[PDB]
Design a protein around this ligand. Structure first.
Ligand code: CLA
Ligand code: CLA
Ligand code: CLA
Ligand code: CLA
Ligand code: CLA
Ligand code: CLA
Ligand code: CLA
Ligand SMILES: CC1=C(/C=C/C(C)=C/C=C/C(C)=C/C=C/C=C(C)/C=C/C=C(C)/C=C/C2=C(C)CCCC2(C)C)C(C)(C)CCC1
Ligand SMILES: CC1=C(/C=C/C(C)=C/C=C\C(C)=C\C=C\C=C(C)/C=C/C=C(C)/C=C/C2=C(C)CCCC2(C)C)C(C)(C)CCC1
Ligand SMILES: CCCCCCCCCCCCO[C@H]1O[C@H](CO)[C@@H](O[C@H]2O[C@H](CO)[C@@H](O)[C@H](O)[C@H]2O)[C@H](O)[C@H]1O
Ligand SMILES: CCCCCCCCCCCCO[C@H]1O[C@H](CO)[C@@H](O[C@H]2O[C@H](CO)[C@@H](O)[C@H](O)[C@H]2O)[C@H](O)[C@H]1O
Ligand SMILES: CC1=C(C/C=C(\C)CCC[C@H](C)CCC[C@@H](C)CCCC(C)C)C(=O)c2ccccc2C1=O
Lengths: 166, 176, 42, 730, 154, 98
């Protein structure tokens, strides 16, 4: 019987988690970029480490890291239903305990607050979308080629290309 | 006993009509001033000098971005404030309706007398040619078909045919 | 001329300008790719 | 109603919830009404008590149709011009195998379109223009493209005369309900002034422009386009400028002539249409009559006159009404219009009237079965609408005490007979066949009924057929052969691939089909006759006319009390007629190919599409699927991957649609309700149904969706079965 | 690979199908368009089914016997998008037929009487509602399970 | 529609696994597979073998009189149209009853 604007703790959290991981992902590229250096999916096996052991399959490195990742991840689902994180930085974020205004249900637009400091992460929000939908682009453009820019005496024009196969 | 048009998007239909016709304005004077070609004569090289061309389509995206923003934002506000929901003033949303869109926010507002207006004084200039332009364009755009079709040469396509005696064009004139 | 929270009406079978057409533009995808039975992607 | 009455709204009503019978569509929502209203969009109980307009509406609806035919057939005549087949065929006829129509190639489509032609891919046609057509002499594709727009002219105008009625402020009573002239005019100068006018453009122009086509040329090597007036040198051949007669009459001399005419009898050789020259004379000799005839007259006068002792007082003022029933003066008509269409269906196949038909087999049997289903689809109607009379149309009683009031007087009587008639037939009219099976499967031919076995012995020959050709003992003069070539006496000789036309001699095994027709024609009519007669009140219900000719059925009591009514007599009477015609068709082609449709070969040894298999083998009613359905139809179920293929590819659907009808025909009604809710439930859980109360079919709608499907199913099945066994061998 | 014999790369039986059939539809020696501008077996209808070729794509594609293709659709080898690729597609499209079914419906029942709005249709296709359907991410897939249509609405 | 369109190709037929698969478990024998973790032997059954299933319930593939005949796209339809039978037949009996 209750009309609108339900959502709550809800999935404001989901997006922001997308923004924060999108930003990190982009950093995972980032890397070559000035010394053109290394490229693309790479499928790397990541940084290395330096060799005595491997040849390297060496087991499933991910499967393991990821079992651990997995009870950090629960910790967060927990918090979100009923909350405890000492910093308390997504759920509201810091400046913490309030967000009371969300906690008892029903806000409808609300902007929000955070940190003992100030400048309300509305500036992290942006730096954060761009990185959302930046993967979007980045992932899209593979299918074809690695690299962007720098110079024209020839490069900018996009004089001849592949298409999609049909 | 007669249809009822009156139709009611409508007043909009007339402002749509201004877009079409004022825009229709660009065409005539410039192409035709045409350079009264021309003293003589016209060369592009320059940009496109040899850069693998200039526009093709890419020219069309820029054309549109520049525009999208404008055509888009736009009618979005020729006007329209209030902007929600339940029941009718009819414009068709009408939301702006009673509230202009704002009591007390700002100067949304332009000018004296709790109003939008530039004010009373002028139909003058621009109802007669600008709408006369509704007319103008149509016949002169109707003139464009007249001016190319018949394609002198190149293409008959699919004939049951049965012309020639002679070609069609524009330079101007008419013969006859 | 139509803003926010539903608009103007329409007749009994504008479905006959919806079966014919829309749907019609689809033969228009079934000759652009004159064929299917699986499909490449984009 | 009142959105807003009278005087003071131009303003139209679109909206506020809309109309019929006074607890008008509720407000509150339903489905059925969307099915109501297409149905019984005109009945005329409702709109007004008083006939007032309606005659002022039915003139307009008529205009719409006349246009529409016109929209049609401009289309057709188009199609016919600019997808030509025709120019090509006509130099070429009897080679060609003709199309107007082509697909475009999208997806599968185009298996369909397979070389027809003077060298183009086609869908082969079996309605013939290209034969209506032969007549135009002048020729060429862009005209027919004028005859075409000449069509779209008549239309827009013969469609703005329908604006120029009802909608325009428009007419009143006297104009129909003073009849006094109307046939006077109609039959006189149109019936007349067409056939007349048709004469003038049926020797002027057509005769000459196929008088020297029946040789070859590349047309226009023959005919200039206007060519044909003040001029005429050309008439000179095909005869004289009357040279010195005067306005017919006599003080005339022929030592050798008599004006164009000169009657034909028999068929052209090398175009076996029949002579293009009795075609002027006959139409001329028509019109006159009509020209004289439509000159009666003003009425009761003649009808009120003769009476007899059985005979009917009623005959007199046999209807002040008639002028204003309508529903009755349509019902009468349909019987005639309808019964006057399938009389076409004979005179056609046993006397072609267009150049190149018979040789053209498939392009005049399609015909003889299309024209055949109308001279039937319009007859059961011609009963329905009498039932619509018999129940309602006049406010009040004052028809009184006649001829009708007479017929009804007996009624458990006229239909008391007719009944036994049918069981006498049926037993003499079908179990007759079943003898054969039961005894040829027992197997003892000595005693079958075979044309050989039970003795008439080997002649059909003399009844009428043999007196009919043999014709000139007579006050008869004329013409080397017959009125119809088929009749027994005369001729080998007709046509150039092929046989067109030959005696057809019957015997038995034409004897007993001819009788199943009787019994089929008869029990059809029983149900319609007893249906329309017992229209209003019955021994089972008296309170019987009270809503309806429609009502579903009165109610579970009286034992049954279901079918009754007369929508339903015109529901179970269609059901038969679908046979009546469906088995008459089955008759003609099995004959016309088992015998007649032919080939000629050196020394003329005739080779019938089937060497008369009919002989001893239709008489067995399995032979009717041994020799028919399983024999022919092998072309339907072989037809895949071809050009016609759309038949084999229909023949499954529509041979499906039929076997979907039974579901609509054979089932309850609060059933699909009882079901429709389980549905409606599941619907509400997700929140997705209630609004516009979804409802099952309206008892009699369910019957409407029987029947109608049972027919467009069971029918096009053969429309496919056919076009698939004349295209290709035959 | 899984029983029906293997793809394009070889399916003789399949090859024989390519050839006879179409190639004969050819085998009307001519029928004449030596210039002539219209009749199109000639060009494509064959060639559009024909420049089907040792290529088709490639597509794998199983070809039973008589070398007509059979579709396994297992999650293997080549074949995955002969059901899922065009499967989720069917799902996504439908459901955004009826997500808006449960929409230019749950928007009325309301105000001053709404007894048959439905047979005329302000705005057509709802439209407004329409795009809700592509702008479902998740959409019903959580909201149907929680709140709105909610067990109580159940 | 496809056929008699004269493209037979571009027919849609599923060669319908689910049965063929039952009847690997049993067998044999048509052209192998391993089927990961049977493999056409290695893992044989091992717990069971020469006792029980012997030569019996081994016609294998066997056109003449196998027991099991070798199922394809023709059978992935009738088998879905016997299934549309007892379902419809029972929505009406289930209903009829309820
Ligand atoms: C010259 C006469 C002609 C005329 C002018 C009329 C006029 C009339 N008839 Mg009528 N009728 C006729 C011939 C005619 N009939 C014939 C030949 C028959 C015998 C079949 C009938 C049997 C008949 C019945 C049983 C009824 C009428 C009724 C009526 C009245 C209702 C009209 C209506 O709502 O349309 C009705 C038309 C529709 C609702 C359209 C549906 C058509 C469907 C069945 C399609 C047909 C199949 C076709 C292949 C489908 C198209 C192709 C598709 C597959 C794509 C009206 C006064 C009705 C009445 O109650 O009297 C007041 C009554 O229902 N008629
Ligand atoms: C509700 C179901 C309907 C019914 C009554 C049946 C019944 C049958 N199928 Mg079957 N099938 C169906 C739908 C159905 N199927 C669908 C939609 C597919 C995919 C096209 C299949 C694919 C299939 C194969 C390959 C085979 C069968 C077979 C069979 C028969 C043997 C037992 C079996 O394998 O069940 C099949 C059971 C299922 C497929 C479980 C799902 C049941 C439906 C109700 C859930 C709907 C899921 C949805 C449509 C797909 C998910 C989306 C997508 C992303 C995957 C049996 C008569 C076998 C057989 O003996 O053929 C001769 C075997 O060959 N089926
Ligand atoms: C004091 C605690 C510490 C904290 C701060 C939390 C906090 C949380 N736990 Mg948790 N947990 C803990 C110790 C803790 N746990 C321990 C020691 C165990 C051992 C079993 C668990 C087992 C556990 C499970 C299985 C789950 C949680 C879940 C949760 C989250 C949802 C709240 C809830 O389900 O309570 C329960 C609320 C109650 C009112 C308890 C009812 C008491 C009985 C008698 C009834 C929340 C973040 C849930 C979750 O986040 O799922 C994604 C659920 O997964 N916990
Ligand atoms: C008698 C009936 C009627 C019917 C059933 C048809 C049917 C057809 N016409 Mg057609 N037509 C008609 C009247 C009709 N026409 C009239 C009155 C005209 C004059 C305006 C035309 C002028 C016309 C043209 C120019 C074309 C057709 C074409 C066609 C075919 C294309 C299908 C289509 O229209 O939609 C899709 C189809 C077989 C098309 C064709 O022949 O190409 C295959 C061609 O486009 N028609
Ligand atoms: C109603 C009919 C139809 C029409 C519109 C015409 C019209 C015409 N006919 Mg004509 N004609 C017709 C039927 C028709 N005919 C038939 C059925 C026959 C034979 C039975 C003829 C035999 C015929 C002859 C021999 C001639 C005409 C001529 C003419 C033209 C002028 C003389 C005339 O008949 O009327 C107008 C009346 C007067 C001039 C007086 C005129 C174009 C003549 C001609 O070529 O032009 C003068 C003359 O050649 N007709
Ligand atoms: C019921 C009335 C009244 C009566 C008693 C009769 C009686 C008769 N009419 Mg009759 N008739 C009547 C009213 C009557 N008509 C009316 C009102 C009309 C105008 C509608 C006619 C028009 C009429 C015609 C055209 C004929 C008769 C004939 C006959 C006779 C049948 C031939 C016969 O039996 O001898 C034959 C016995 C032999 C032994 C030989 C019979 C005497 C027929 C007749 O003239 O006699 C053959 C003739 O068919 N009637
Ligand atoms: C369809 C199902 C189901 C059923 C009813 C059976 C029934 C049977 N299995 Mg069996 N089995 C099954 C699934 C099933 N299995 C599965 C999924 C596996 C794979 C792990 C096996 C692997 C298996 C083995 C290895 C054997 C059996 C054997 C047997 C038979 C005797 C068991 C016993 O000694 O007590 C019995 C007919 C035994 C047998 O008698 O076969 C020779 C033995 O060989 N089964
Ligand atoms: C005054 C005048 C006049 C008049 C003129 C006119 C106007 C005329 C006409 C003419 C006409 C007026 C004609 C008509 C004709 C008609 C017809 C010829 C009919 C038809 C039809 C059809 C063809 C149809 C058919 C069909 C059928 C069979 C049925 C149904 C189907 C269909 C439709 C197909 C005159 C001349 C003296 C001159 C002087 C002045
Ligand atoms: C999946 C789906 C579907 C389905 C489809 C199908 C499955 C179908 C079918 C169908 C069938 C399975 C059958 C049908 C048939 C039809 C018909 C058939 C129609 C019509 C007709 C006509 C047009 C006719 C005409 C005629 C005349 C003139 C008279 C008589 C004769 C004839 C009949 C010839 C669709 C896509 C739809 C939708 C979506 C989903
Ligand atoms: C959350 C649960 C689901 C919600 C669905 C139920 C909706 C509630 C329905 C309203 C119940 C009856 O309410 C009813 O009383 C009102 C006042 O007493 C009346 O209201 C009327 O009288 C007023 C007097 O000035 C006028 O200003 C109002 O315009 C007029 O509507 C109406 O007759 C009706 O609105
Ligand atoms: C089908 C069962 C036969 C029962 C009916 C037989 C009785 C009549 C005899 C045969 C009927 C066919 O009639 C046919 O006779 C001859 C075949 O021999 C052919 O005879 C034709 O061919 C020759 C060419 O100059 C000449 O012999 C004739 O002058 C000519 O009429 C004809 O094409 C046709 O007129
Ligand atoms: C099967 C059957 C039904 C059930 C048949 C029904 C309910 C047919 C009505 C179905 C309608 C035509 C579906 C209409 C829905 C669509 C038109 C709406 C969406 C619009 C589209 C764009 C798809 C009866 O109601 C019935 C009544 C009396 C005697 C026999 C029978 C009978 O045999």
């Amino acid at each position: 019987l209750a009309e609108d604007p339900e959502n709550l703790r809800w999935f404001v959290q989901a997006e922001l988690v997308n923004g924060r991981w999108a930003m990190l992902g982009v950093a995972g590229m980032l890397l070559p970029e000035v010394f053109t250096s290394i490229g693309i999916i790479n499928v790397p096996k990541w940084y290395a480490a330096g060799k005595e052991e491997y040849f390297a399959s060496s087991s499933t490195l991910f499967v393991i890291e990821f079992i651990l990742s997995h009870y950090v991840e629960i910790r967060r689902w927990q918090d979100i239903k009923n909350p405890g994180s000492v910093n308390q930085d997504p759920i509201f974020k810091q400046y913490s305990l309030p967000a009371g205004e969300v906690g008892y249900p029903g806000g409808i637009f609300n902007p929000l607050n955070f940190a003992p400091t100030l400048e309300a992460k509305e500036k992290e929000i942006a730096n954060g979308r761009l990185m959302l939908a930046f993967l979007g682009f980045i992932i899209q453009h593979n299918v074809t080629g690695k690299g962007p820019f720098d110079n024209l005496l020839q490069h900018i024009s996009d004089p001849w290309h592949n298409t999609i196969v049909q | 006993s007669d249809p009822e048009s009156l139709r009611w998007n409508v007043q909009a239909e007339l402002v749509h009509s201004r877009w079409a016709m004022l825009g229709a304005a660009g065409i005539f004077i410039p192409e035709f001033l045409t350079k009264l070609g021309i003293l003589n004569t016209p060369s592009w090289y320059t940009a496109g000098e040899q850069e693998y061309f200039t526009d093709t389509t890419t020219l069309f995206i820029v054309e549109l971005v520049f525009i999208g923003w404008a055509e888009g934002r736009r009618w979005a506000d020729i006007l329209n404030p209030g902007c929600v929901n339940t029941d009718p003033i009819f414009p068709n949303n009408k939301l702006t309706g009673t509230d202009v869109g704002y009591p007390g926010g700002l100067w949304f507002d332009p000018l004296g007398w709790g109003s939008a207006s530039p004010q009373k004084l002028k139909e003058l200039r621009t109802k007669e040619i600008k709408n006369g332009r509704l007319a103008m364009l149509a016949v002169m755009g109707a003139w464009f078909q007249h001016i190319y079709t018949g394609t002198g040469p190149i293409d008959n396509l699919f004939a049951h045919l049965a012309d020639p005696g002679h070609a069609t064009i524009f330079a101007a004139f008419t013969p006859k | 001329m139509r803003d926010l929270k539903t608009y103007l009406s329409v007749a009994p079978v504008v479905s006959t300008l919806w079966f014919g057409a829309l749907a019609g533009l689809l033969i228009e995808i079934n000759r652009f790719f004159p064929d299917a039975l699986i499909f490449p992607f984009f | 109603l009142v959105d807003r009455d009278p005087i003071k709204t131009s303003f139209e009503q679109w909206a506020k919830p809309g109309h019929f019978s006074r607890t008008i569509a509720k407000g509150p929502d339903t489905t059925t009404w969307i099915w109501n209203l297409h149905a019984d969009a005109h009945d005329f109980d409702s709109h007004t008590s008083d006939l007032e307009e309606i005659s002022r509406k039915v003139f307009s609806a008529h205009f719409g149709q006349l246009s529409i035919i016109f929209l049609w057939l401009s289309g057709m005549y188009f199609h016919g011009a600019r997808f030509s087949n025709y120019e090509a065929w006509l130099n070429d006829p009897t080679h060609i195998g003709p199309s107007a129509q082509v697909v475009w190639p999208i997806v599968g489509q185009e298996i369909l379109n397979g070389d027809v032609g003077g060298g183009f891919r086609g869908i082969q046609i079996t309605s013939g223009f290209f034969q209506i057509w032969r007549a135009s002499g002048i020729t060429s594709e862009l005209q027919l493209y004028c005859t075409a727009i000449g069509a779209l002219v008549f239309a827009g105008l013969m469609l703005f005369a329908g604006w120029f009625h009802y909608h325009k402020a428009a007419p009143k009573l006297a104009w129909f309900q003073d009849v006094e002239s109307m046939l006077n005019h109609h039959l006189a100068g149109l019936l007349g002034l067409g056939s007349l006018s048709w004469a003038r453009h049926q020797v002027h122009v057509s005769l000459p422009i196929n008088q020297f086509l029946n040789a070859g040329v590349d047309p226009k090597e023959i005919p200039l386009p206007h060519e044909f007036i003040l001029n005429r040198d050309l008439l000179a051949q095909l005869y004289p400028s009357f040279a010195e007669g005067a306005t017919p009459f006599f003080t005339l001399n022929w030592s050798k002539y008599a004006d164009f005419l000169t009657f034909r009898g028999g068929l052209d050789p090398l175009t076996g249409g029949l002579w293009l020259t009795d075609i002027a004379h006959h139409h001329l000799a028509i019109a006159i009559l009509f020209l004289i005839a439509g000159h009666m007259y003003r009425i009761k006068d003649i009808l009120e006159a003769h009476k007899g002792p059985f005979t009917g007082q009623g005959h007199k003022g046999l209807y002040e009404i008639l002028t204003t029933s309508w529903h009755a003066q349509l019902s009468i008509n349909l019987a005639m219009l309808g019964s006057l269409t399938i009389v076409v269906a004979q005179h056609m196949y046993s006397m072609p009237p267009y150049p190149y038909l018979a040789t053209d087999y498939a392009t005049q049997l399609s015909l003889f079965t299309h024209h055949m289903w109308i001279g039937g689809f319009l007859i059961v109607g011609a009963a329905a609408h009498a039932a619509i009379f018999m129940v309602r149309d006049y406010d009040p009683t004052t028809r009184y005490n006649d001829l009708l009031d007479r017929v009804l007087r007996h009624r458990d009587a006229i239909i008391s007979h007719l009944n036994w008639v049918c069981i006498f037939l049926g037993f003499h009219s079908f179990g007759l066949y079943i003898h054969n099976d039961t005894m040829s499967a027992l197997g003892r031919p000595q005693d079958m009924f075979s044309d050989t076995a039970i003795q008439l012995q080997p002649v059909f020959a003399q009844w009428i057929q043999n007196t009919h050709a043999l014709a000139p003992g007579t006050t008869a003069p004329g013409a080397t052969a017959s009125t119809s070539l088929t009749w027994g006496g005369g001729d080998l000789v007709a046509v150039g691939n092929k046989v067109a036309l030959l005696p057809i001699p019957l015997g038995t095994a034409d004897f007993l089909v001819h009788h199943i027709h009787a019994f089929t024609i008869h029990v059809t009519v029983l149900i319609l006759l007893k249906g329309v007669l017992f229209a209003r009140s019955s021994r089972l219900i008296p309170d019987k006319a009270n809503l309806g000719f429609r009502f579903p059925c009165d109610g579970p009591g009286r034992g049954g009390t279901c079918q009754v009514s007369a929508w339903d007599h015109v529901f179970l009477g269609l059901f038969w007629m679908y046979n009546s015609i469906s088995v008459v068709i089955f008759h003609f082609s099995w004959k016309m190919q088992s015998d007649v449709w032919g080939t000629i070969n050196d020394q003329g040894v005739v080779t019938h599409i089937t060497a008369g298999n009919f002989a001893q083998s239709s008489i067995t009613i399995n032979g009717w699927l041994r020799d028919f359905l399983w024999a022919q139809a092998s072309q339907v179920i072989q037809s895949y991957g071809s050009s016609l293929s759309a038949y084999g590819l229909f023949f499954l659907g529509a041979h499906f649609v039929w076997a979907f009808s039974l579901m609509f025909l054979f089932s309850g009604r609060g059933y699909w309700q009882e079901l429709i809710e389980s549905i409606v439930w599941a619907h509400n859980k997700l929140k997705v149904a209630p609004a516009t109360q979804p409802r099952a079919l309206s008892i009699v709608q369910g019957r409407a969706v029987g029947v109608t499907h049972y027919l467009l199913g069971g029918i096009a099945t053969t429309w496919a079965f056919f076009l698939a066994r004349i295209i290709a061998v035959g | 690979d899984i029983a029906g014999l293997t793809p394009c790369k070889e399916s003789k039986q399949f090859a024989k199908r390519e050839k006879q059939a179409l190639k004969k539809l050819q085998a009307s020696l001519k029928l004449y368009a030596d210039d002539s501008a219209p009749a199109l077996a000639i060009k494509a209808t064959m060639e559009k089914t024909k420049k089907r070729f040792d290529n088709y794509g490639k597509y794998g594609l199983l070809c039973g016997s008589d070398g007509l293709p059979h579709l396994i659709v297992s999650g293997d080898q080549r074949h995955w998008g002969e059901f899922i690729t065009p499967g989720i597609l069917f799902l996504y499209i439908a459901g955004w037929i009826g997500w808006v079914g449960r929409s230019y419906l749950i928007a009325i029942r309301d105000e001053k009487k709404p007894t048959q709005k439905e047979i005329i249709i302000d705005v057509p296709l709802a439209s407004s509602l329409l795009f809700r359907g592509f702008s479902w991410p998740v959409a019903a897939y959580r909201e149907l399970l929680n709140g709105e249509l909610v067990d109580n609405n159940f | 529609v496809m056929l008699a369109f004269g493209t037979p190709e571009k027919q849609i037929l599923i060669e319908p696994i689910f049965a063929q698969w039952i009847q690997s478990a049993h067998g044999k024998t048509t052209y192998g597979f391993d089927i990961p973790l049977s493999s056409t032997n290695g893992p044989a059954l091992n717990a069971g073998r020469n006792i029980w299933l012997p030569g019996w319930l081994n016609a294998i593939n066997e056109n003449s009189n196998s027991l099991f005949l070798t199922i394809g796209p023709g059978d992935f339809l009738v088998h879905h149209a016997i299934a549309l039978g007892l379902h419809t037949t029972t929505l009406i009996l289930v209903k009829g009853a309820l």
